Design a protein around this ligand. Sequence first.
Ligand SMILES: *[C@@H]1O[C@H](CO)[C@@H](O[C@@H]2O[C@H](CO)[C@@H](O[C@@H]3O[C@H](CO[C@H]4O[C@H](CO)[C@@H](O)[C@H](O[C@H]5O[C@H](CO)[C@@H](O)[C@H](O)[C@@H]5O)[C@@H]4O)[C@@H](O)[C@H](O[C@H]4O[C@H](CO)[C@@H](O)[C@H](O)[C@@H]4O[C@H]4O[C@H](CO)[C@@H](O)[C@H](O)[C@@H]4O)[C@@H]3O)[C@H](O)[C@H]2NC(C)=O)[C@H](O)[C@H]1NC(C)=O
Ligand SMILES: *[C@@H]1O[C@H](CO)[C@@H](O[C@@H]2O[C@H](CO)[C@@H](O[C@@H]3O[C@H](CO[C@H]4O[C@H](CO)[C@@H](O)[C@H](O)[C@@H]4O)[C@@H](O)[C@H](O[C@H]4O[C@H](CO)[C@@H](O)[C@H](O)[C@@H]4O[C@H]4O[C@H](CO)[C@@H](O)[C@H](O)[C@@H]4O)[C@@H]3O)[C@H](O)[C@H]2NC(C)=O)[C@H](O)[C@H]1NC(C)=O
Ligand SMILES: *[C@@H]1O[C@H](CO)[C@@H](O[C@@H]2O[C@H](CO)[C@@H](O[C@@H]3O[C@H](CO[C@H]4O[C@H](CO)[C@@H](O)[C@H](O[C@H]5O[C@H](CO)[C@@H](O)[C@H](O)[C@@H]5O)[C@@H]4O)[C@@H](O)[C@H](O[C@H]4O[C@H](CO)[C@@H](O)[C@H](O)[C@@H]4O)[C@@H]3O)[C@H](O)[C@H]2NC(C)=O)[C@H](O)[C@H]1NC(C)=O
Ligand SMILES: *[C@@H]1O[C@H](CO)[C@@H](O[C@@H]2O[C@H](CO)[C@@H](O[C@@H]3O[C@H](CO)[C@@H](O)[C@H](O)[C@@H]3O)[C@H](O)[C@H]2NC(C)=O)[C@H](O)[C@H]1NC(C)=O
Ligand SMILES: [Cu+2]
Lengths: 101, 680, 678, 100, 50, 50
Amino acid sequence: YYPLLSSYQLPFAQRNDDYYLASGDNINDIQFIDTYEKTFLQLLQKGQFKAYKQEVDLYNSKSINFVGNYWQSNADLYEKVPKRNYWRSYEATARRVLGAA
Amino acid sequence: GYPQYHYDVETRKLDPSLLNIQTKVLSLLENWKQVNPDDEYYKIGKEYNVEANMESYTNREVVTEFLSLYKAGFIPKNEVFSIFYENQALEVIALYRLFYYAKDFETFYKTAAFARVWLNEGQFVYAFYLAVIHRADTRGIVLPAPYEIWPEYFMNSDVLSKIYRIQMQKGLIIPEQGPYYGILSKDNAYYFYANYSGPLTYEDNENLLSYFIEDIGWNSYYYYFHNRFPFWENGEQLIGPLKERRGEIYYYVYQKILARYYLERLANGLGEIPRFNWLDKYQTSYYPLLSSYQLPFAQRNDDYYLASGDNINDIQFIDTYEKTFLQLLQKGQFKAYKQEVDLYNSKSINFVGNYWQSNADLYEKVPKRNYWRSYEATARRVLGAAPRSSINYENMNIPTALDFYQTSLRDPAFYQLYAKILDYINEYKEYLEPYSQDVLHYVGVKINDVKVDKLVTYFEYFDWNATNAVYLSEQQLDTVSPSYIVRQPRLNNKPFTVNIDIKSDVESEVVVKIFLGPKYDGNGLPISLEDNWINFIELDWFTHKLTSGQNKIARKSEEFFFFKDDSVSLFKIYELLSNGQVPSYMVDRYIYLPRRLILPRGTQRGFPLQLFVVVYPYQAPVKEWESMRQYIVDNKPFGYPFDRPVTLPYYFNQPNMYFKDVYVYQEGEQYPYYNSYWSQ
Amino acid sequence: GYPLFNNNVKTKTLDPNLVNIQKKVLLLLENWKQVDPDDEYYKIGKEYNIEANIESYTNREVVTEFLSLYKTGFTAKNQIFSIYYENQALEVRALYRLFYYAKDFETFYKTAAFARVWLNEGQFIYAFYIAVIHRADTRGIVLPAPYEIWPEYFVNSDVLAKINRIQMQKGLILPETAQYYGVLAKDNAYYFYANYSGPWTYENNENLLSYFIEDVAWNSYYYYFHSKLQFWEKGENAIGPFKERRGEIYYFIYQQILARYYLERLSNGLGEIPRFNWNDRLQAGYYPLLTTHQIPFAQRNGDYYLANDDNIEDIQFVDSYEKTFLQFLQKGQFKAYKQEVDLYNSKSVNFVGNYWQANVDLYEKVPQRNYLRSYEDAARRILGAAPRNSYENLNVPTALDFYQTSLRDPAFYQLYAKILDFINQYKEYLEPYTQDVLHFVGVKINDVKVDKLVTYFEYFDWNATNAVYLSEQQLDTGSPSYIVRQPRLNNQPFTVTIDIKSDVESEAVIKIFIGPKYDGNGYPIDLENNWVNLVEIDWFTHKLTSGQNKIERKSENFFWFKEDSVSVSKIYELLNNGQVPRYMIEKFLLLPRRLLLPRGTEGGVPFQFFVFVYPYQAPYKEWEPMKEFVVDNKPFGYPFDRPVTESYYFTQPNMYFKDVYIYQEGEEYPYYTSYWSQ
Amino acid sequence: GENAIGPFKERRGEIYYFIYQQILARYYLERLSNGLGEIPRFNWNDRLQAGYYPLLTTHQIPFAQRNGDYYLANDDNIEDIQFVDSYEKTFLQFLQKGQF
Amino acid sequence: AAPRNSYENLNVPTALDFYQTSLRDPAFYQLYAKILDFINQYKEYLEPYT
Amino acid sequence: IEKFLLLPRRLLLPRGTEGGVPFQFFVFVYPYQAPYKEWEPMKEFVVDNK
Ligand SMILES: *[C@@H]1O[C@H](CO)[C@@H](O[C@@H]2O[C@H](CO)[C@@H](O[C@@H]3O[C@H](CO[C@H]4O[C@H](CO)[C@@H](O)[C@H](O[C@H]5O[C@H](CO)[C@@H](O)[C@H](O)[C@@H]5O)[C@@H]4O)[C@@H](O)[C@H](O[C@H]4O[C@H](CO)[C@@H](O)[C@H](O)[C@@H]4O[C@H]4O[C@H](CO)[C@@H](O)[C@H](O)[C@@H]4O)[C@@H]3O)[C@H](O)[C@H]2NC(C)=O)[C@H](O)[C@H]1NC(C)=O
Ligand SMILES: *[C@@H]1O[C@H](CO)[C@@H](O[C@@H]2O[C@H](CO)[C@@H](O[C@@H]3O[C@H](CO[C@H]4O[C@H](CO)[C@@H](O)[C@H](O)[C@@H]4O)[C@@H](O)[C@H](O[C@H]4O[C@H](CO)[C@@H](O)[C@H](O)[C@@H]4O[C@H]4O[C@H](CO)[C@@H](O)[C@H](O)[C@@H]4O)[C@@H]3O)[C@H](O)[C@H]2NC(C)=O)[C@H](O)[C@H]1NC(C)=O
Ligand SMILES: *[C@@H]1O[C@H](CO)[C@@H](O[C@@H]2O[C@H](CO)[C@@H](O[C@@H]3O[C@H](CO[C@H]4O[C@H](CO)[C@@H](O)[C@H](O[C@H]5O[C@H](CO)[C@@H](O)[C@H](O)[C@@H]5O)[C@@H]4O)[C@@H](O)[C@H](O[C@H]4O[C@H](CO)[C@@H](O)[C@H](O)[C@@H]4O)[C@@H]3O)[C@H](O)[C@H]2NC(C)=O)[C@H](O)[C@H]1NC(C)=O
Ligand SMILES: *[C@@H]1O[C@H](CO)[C@@H](O[C@@H]2O[C@H](CO)[C@@H](O[C@@H]3O[C@H](CO)[C@@H](O)[C@H](O)[C@@H]3O)[C@H](O)[C@H]2NC(C)=O)[C@H](O)[C@H]1NC(C)=O
Ligand SMILES: [Cu+2]
């Protein structure tokens, strides 16, 4: 992707073809991403569980709500836990990795 | 050409009741690689039987387990020993447990003689050193420095080759030609000039800092840290009153070790510590010129692939471990290993530390497990690059620098691995609430000025005894051993004083802390405190009494709390013992970094740094920490106030805090290799 | 437990005239690692001046060049020497030329004493060995075996460590326990049992054949081949009239080495020799347990990428050097290096060989060049995996840097297999042999019988005293004997009987080859593909009378094999009676007879023998000075010097193929050397 | 050469070599002064290890950006790559011929 | 590293496309170091000064 | 107008450090020989025939 976009005359980042995403500089981020995905799969094996102090049953369609929030890392996902100074978003990390800045 | 090191030794009178133990210990460490039938310990060990004296050991299960393992058979003599070899680890742990639970010093001496006569020399020396460090009745005696007990682990192959040639020839065939090759015959002894490793061993210009990472004091400090806090021992025996802080200690030491290292990288213009991915080729190579029993150390080629099939299992475990920790960070509060953990509390640091060390305290609440694996051990095995056949087969091993605590700091990969671990731990630390103004602001105290004398570094010759590296003849054992002394350049700094001016509205006791840190990063830009809090090194930590009005505090670098003097040689130890005195620092301050390594050198001949001075109220440690007063000055966590992330730097612009910019210069030769005959 | 090897040496009387020279030569090889001021050579070396004796050397340019080089300064003592280091090679070449062009033996002895006194020990020993091999006045003199001159290059680190410990201790402190560590004290000597390298050093099950690739004589053969024909010497001064057959010798020797290695691999069930790509990574791990001056040898992991940042240039050269050759194959007839080359003619082999060795003969027609490059040198540097540095005073030794240790590395075999594949692609040009050349009218081989083929392991003792540094007292009076006792492969005597029918009475030549029958996949190998894997074992002449004929050839009389060398003590003992080991003077460049057959199995390993009878023709006249290495005018490896295209037209009545089995007696593995196994 | 340099037409290659060598020597001196080491070498069939993100524009069109690990041999470059390689190898062949 | 296209009316400028900006790119120095390495390999032929 | 193709004098020395950066100077004196005749139109960029 080679965008011809600029803000304040600063060019937008260009992603070269065959860009390697798992370099050392990004490795930490990569791990988090992977871990996140892994966790969800484990939940699919559990079916019924408790996450972020919320009881979840995947046999019920209502659980969709939780799922959505889980993949957005929004505020509602952490409403039942004490205010956390530590926070990370899957979408933000993925956007940073794919941006190639 | 460099000057010669001359310094006076701080001495304290030795308790007359300990004059017998000391000698005995020093007698059992003489030429430990060989057994002399003419010595008393030989007969004592040959005749001693453990089972018949089972009543002389407090614990009975220790004796039974040792007897069972001994019946199973220990490793043969004349083989490389490492604590990371599982069977050898079990045998040496059993031997150490037998040593530790001996009821009296006489039984301990008999058991040590038995072990030396019958068991592998490496296991014997390791266990004996650990027991002497940890036994109650041996508190107060002095042990030789590690580099004098294992000279082969603190020198390169060329100097060892020269020493072996001299020993085989029993002198110089043509003495006049000795000086041209760095061998000096003087005063009944032979001095060998030693260099540091060059570009053949290190790539990417890292050899510039070899003098620092191959320094004997650095590796000896790491070995002392291992001996004082072994991972396989329970915390209660190691630290009784402050066991719950074990993990904190694990975080404090490594955080320091890396930070200083990073500082040196900035001094030589090498930048930040690289990060790596397990599932990708490793880019840092290493070609050590080290050998044990003539067996070469493993060499890691550049672009070595770590995720081959043979190692795949290990890799998976490593990955899984890391993954698990991240999941914990998402849970915040949980139960692991039958321990309730809340990450919002600073105390949880303990658990975190243990989790990343895989020590005994991590599994104290679960039934004894026959299945056990260590993240650090697996990572060391993967990064060592030794052939897999060495790992699989038990009666053969190719040594690696990461298999010994005396040589781990020589390998660059160690720093990267522990930097990754500390990155995980700091990600955990991000949970903690930052210190507020109320806790940081000392109402009524203002620091007016901080002055520092010129900071100068230079290389000087240092001599250490390496006689234990060679095998002696019968006549030498009978009459007297030869003296082979290694003379090598070493970094040092001239004395300097820190003067602090304080204006106080009231009279009170205060605690003053002095830290050192870098100013610019590898890219040449200033480092904000939000990222520099981890890079500060704690220099001094002491109490004082402030009177109303103006006060001046002069603190000499020779009095800093976190640094010690250089260890003395064996001959000087005997000389002082004959006069009933011992070196105090080697007695009770050996767990601290040498004072000669406080300041970096700098390749540009001038390096900028910053000093941080903080004054806060004094509060006495709780009474139960009574037998640890010499090492604790107050009740604050180690590294305070830089123990948790800094979010808003303007909270540290307090009256009772001061940042100062300083410069370190170099005097004399910039490089340490100018030690030839024609340059001297 | 294995039997101990004892065998009397077949000796021959030595000419009295050379006796003194022999003495002197040996005196110059004693404790060459050290300089003894009390020895005779010391004063001569310290007082000799080459320039003042410039008239004593036949050539003046050599003296001028040597003096000019010496003015700049040679390498320091106690340093690692390798012929593949450019500056050291340049110095040692001048030293060897000075040795070679000495007028008489006295001047050569003076120069050798000077070199030992002043110059590096490794350069001195190398040059002196080569000169003694080549000097005419020293012809007929016995030299010690290479493994006794460089023991550290022929034994692993553990045995050397034990020897060094004994030397430092000047004996045993607790003798009654040394037996349990493979150290025996007996008859004023110390014997050290030694094992071969295991899987820790070799991966992919290669260690199973460590007894062969690490054999002392196996590497000594390659060192002898290098010494007799060195790449940096002109053909005239090294071989004489066989100057146009240099490439043929190169190809033949390397092909035979690779064929024997392949036979051993088949006997150990390891398959064919792997091929590799330069732009890809090598798949042969090697962790040598070897040291020189305590400096470890370079180690290579299992998956090593050959093309890194610091090698690109070399890589490029290698690639180009290959592609050019392919281009030649397309041109056929061309002009290269001021030499006209026609690939349709068999003689062109010479050029090809030189092209793949980059020897001086390749550049004899172009003006003296200051730009020097070698394909083999660059390939060895790339495959050694040693750290790359631009400093000339710092090197990490590798097995490929020395001809004494080259055969220990599989990469050597892979590289030379690639080279021989290119050479066989070239050989495809040649016209195949026809029936008229092969058929021996009036001669038919009726039968061939062979006795039982047996292999075993036996203890062999060799002196390793030169590896240690002696004390003044030991130098003045006498040093102890440190002897290495290790298992070695050997075979029992066998005889080949050939029954032939020929009504015509004539002279004939008989050749015997040994080769494989099944490949790694378990299928039979057709002759059209097996012609490159046949090893020549015998080559002789015989007169056939009318009627029936029965020829009995004993394994002790085969042309291409010798007997084992002996230690220096026996050499002195025989010299005191005016005798020398005949096989150390005669046929000292050939493989030992103990390595003739691959190690067998209890059940038996299958191989085959090829017997060929053809007409005799005497070697040419100008070939007279070399009529001890040849038997006729046919090319080496005849008739398998060129590809076989149709096996039907190759087979003739005067050829015979027989299938045989090799058995093993005693222990199958060589590591049963513990105190409890004896 | 006639219309650009005149009588120094047979010394054009000398000027080229001298100017480029001086430029690279000055660059190496600056690197040493900044403690960056020697100039890295690269392989065409391997990837370049020099990232560059210029903040330059002409007619508001951004300049091309290159990441840290850029693979030089992709689908759309093969031809060019081949030429480069050949152009090098031919030169090496000349070095073997000497006079040609 | 500019995108490759067969159209003559569309180009993405690079520092190496102009002599005014060539020296800003390290790749320039690396490439000409390679070229000068080849030229020095050639120079090895010449006889050294006496 | 004069010497407008040469490097500026401000770039003669590499940037130094507070402590000081080490370099070296090489001074060479040799015999003089005038540039050739046909080289006359360019006798503002050369000093001899070397
Ligand atoms: C830790 O590492 C450091 C860093 O490497 C080591 O320091 C090195 O040590 C070696 C050996 O000790 C030094 O080499 C020696 O240097 C001597 C000084 O020479 C200077 O003056 C002479 C003129 O008198 C110059 O020629 C030298 O350099 C110039 O010339 C050389 C010629 O090659 C050029 O290459 C240079 O670029 C310069 O143009 C120096 O300015 C030197 O005298 C000595 O030379 C003797 O030995 C060599 C051995 O190869 C011979 O070639 C030479 O002809 C001389 O002959 C002597 O040889 C033996 C003794 O070895 C005897 O037969 C006689 O005594 C005979 O005189 C040698 O080259 C090196 O300079 C030095 N590097 C430094 C300081 O940077 C430390 O040693 C090392 N420490 C340990 C313990 O390992
Ligand atoms: C080349 O390579 C080969 C293969 O690697 C190697 O062979 C091996 O040698 C070692 C010795 O170095 C052998 O190990 C010894 O084996 C004997 C025999 O064991 C067999 O028989 C016993 C019953 O008698 C069985 O229980 C056993 O399972 C075997 O079947 C043992 O007797 C030895 O034990 C002693 O030494 C051990 C330490 O090595 C002790 O743990 C053990 O308790 C014994 O101690 C003895 O010595 C002590 C010290 O003096 C003393 O205090 C004790 O009282 C006791 O006397 C030992 O395990 C191994 O089996 C061999 N393997 C093979 C396949 O042959 C060669 O040695 C090697 N050669 C060279 C030159 O390197
Ligand atoms: C480098 O490192 C090497 C090795 O560590 C150093 O060499 C060591 O030096 C020290 C100091 O010189 C030695 O210790 C001293 O040894 C002497 C000599 O002891 C021998 O001779 C005695 C008779 O003269 C003899 O009695 C001794 O045997 C007794 O002791 C042994 C146990 O050691 C016992 O088994 C016997 O049954 C005997 O009982 C022995 O054969 C000794 O006289 C000294 O003792 C004095 O000091 C002690 C301690 O204060 C005191 O208790 C005594 O009463 C006496 O006053 C002392 O032990 C050491 O032995 C050397 N090591 C070796 C292996 O030789 C070398 O000096 C270093 N060089 C440097 C640093 O430059
Ligand atoms: C192993 O090798 C060593 C060294 O090569 C042998 O020692 C050498 O032995 C020979 C023969 O005994 C010595 O030569 C003789 O010396 C005596 C004087 O002692 C002299 O009178 C004789 O005429 C002859 O020259 C030689 O000096 C000696 N070398 C050393 C360094 O001592 C050893 O014998 C060998 N052992 C075996 C078992 O082969
Ligand atoms: Cu690298």
